[PDB]
């Protein structure tokens, strides 16, 4: 309940889990990411030591302690949590979802030109701060990378998430941002649908699904054909034609 000035409070989230604590001597509220050892997470810490933009958490403190079990990193508490639960049966209106997704398309610009391919982006992640703007969040599986882009072979992440070039049974290499792109894609599709595009129980069934289910779209609710276009674009299946950030930015129903 007690770690130095701050004092842990309720759990707010859940790798490992968020509570709610409290910063006497500052008086404030902070979001404490509580993880049990049981070097990836001092990659995370890297990663996030660096990020200083607007739309991307920010990293205040970690409290690691050799003799304890337990590490902490606190950040500045991004009050409204979740932009949206998926499943949900009350999906956001379009202009809801252009609003959030012009959020998105800035924070993950900003951590491409910083070398970082988030690799989990998804609604839950994507938290809505003090001034209503979103703040993408948990960069727990995210990679750095030098050059013009990240060649990865490892798949991880969220599942309904996952890019089809991510999920070939041999283990081949793909590219970083096209991932954070089909992952946007798959985002924005749950922003006004409530409901992620392929869905299995079975996980070798989803991602048989991931790469070979083409796009479908539920008549109602019904949406703007420059959506679907978009959406389209950033879920084609192929990594070398699927859109670019940069395409995105420019869109007819991103300006629109
Ligand atoms: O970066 C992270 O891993 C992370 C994960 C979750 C949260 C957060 C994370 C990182 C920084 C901040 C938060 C955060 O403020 N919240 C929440 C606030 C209200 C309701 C739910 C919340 N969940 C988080």
Same mark, same amino acid.
């Given at each position: 309940?007690?770690?130095?000035?701050?004092?842990?409070?309720?759990?707010?989230?859940?790798?490992?889990?968020?509570?709610?604590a409290?910063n006497?001597?500052?008086?404030?509220?902070?979001?404490?990411?509580?993880?049990?050892?049981?070097?990836?997470?001092?990659?995370?810490?890297?990663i996030?030591?660096?990020?200083?933009?607007?739309?991307?958490?920010?990293?205040?403190?970690?409290?690691?302690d050799?003799?304890?079990?337990?590490?902490?990193?606190?950040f500045?508490?991004?009050?409204?949590?979740?932009?949206?639960?998926?499943?949900?049966?009350?999906?956001l209106?379009?202009?809801?979802?252009?609003?959030?997704?012009?959020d998105?398309?800035?924070? &993950?610009?900003?951590? *491409?030109?910083?070398?970082?391919?988030?690799?989990?982006?998804? #609604?839950?992640?994507?938290?809505?701060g +003090? =001034?209503?703007?979103?703040?993408?969040?948990?960069?727990?599986?995210?990679?750095?990378?030098?050059?013009?882009?990240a060649?990865?072979?490892?798949?991880?992440?969220?599942?309904?998430?996952?890019?089809?070039?991510?999920?070939?049974?041999?283990?081949?290499?793909?590219?970083?941002?096209?991932?954070?792109?089909?992952?946007?894609?798959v985002?924005?599709?749950?922003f006004?649908?409530?409901?992620?595009?392929?869905?299995?129980?079975? &996980?070798?069934?989803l *991602?048989?699904?991931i790469?070979?289910?083409?796009?479908?779209? #539920?008549?109602?609710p019904?949406?703007a +054909? =420059?959506?679907?276009?978009?959406?389209?674009?950033?879920?084609?299946?192929?990594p070398?034609?699927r859109?670019?950030?940069?395409?995105?930015?420019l869109?007819?129903?991103?300006?629109?």
């Amino acid at each position: 309940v007690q770690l130095n000035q701050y004092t842990l409070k309720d759990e707010i989230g859940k790798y490992g889990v968020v509570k709610l604590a409290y910063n006497e001597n500052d008086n404030t509220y902070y979001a404490m990411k509580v993880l049990s050892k049981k070097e990836q997470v001092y990659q995370e810490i890297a990663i996030l030591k660096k990020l200083d933009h607007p739309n991307v958490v920010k990293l205040v403190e970690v409290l690691d302690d050799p003799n304890e079990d337990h590490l902490y990193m606190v950040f500045e508490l991004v009050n409204q949590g979740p932009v949206m639960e998926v499943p949900t049966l009350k999906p956001l209106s379009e202009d809801q979802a252009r609003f959030y997704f012009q959020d998105l398309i800035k924070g &993950i610009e900003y951590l *491409h030109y910083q070398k970082i391919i988030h690799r989990d982006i998804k #609604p839950s992640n994507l938290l809505v701060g +003090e =001034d209503g703007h979103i703040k993408i969040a948990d960069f727990g599986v995210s990679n750095e990378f030098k050059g013009s882009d990240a060649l990865l072979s490892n798949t991880v992440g969220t599942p309904a998430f996952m890019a089809p070039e991510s999920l070939s049974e041999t283990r081949k290499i793909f590219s970083g941002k096209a991932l954070d792109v089909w992952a946007m894609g798959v985002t924005l599709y749950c922003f006004v649908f409530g409901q992620c595009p392929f869905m299995d129980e079975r &996980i070798m069934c989803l *991602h048989s699904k991931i790469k070979s289910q083409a796009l479908e779209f #539920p008549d109602q609710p019904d949406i703007a +054909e =420059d959506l679907k276009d978009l959406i389209t674009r950033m879920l084609d299946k192929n990594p070398e034609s699927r859109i670019v950030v940069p395409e995105i930015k420019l869109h007819p129903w991103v300006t629109r």
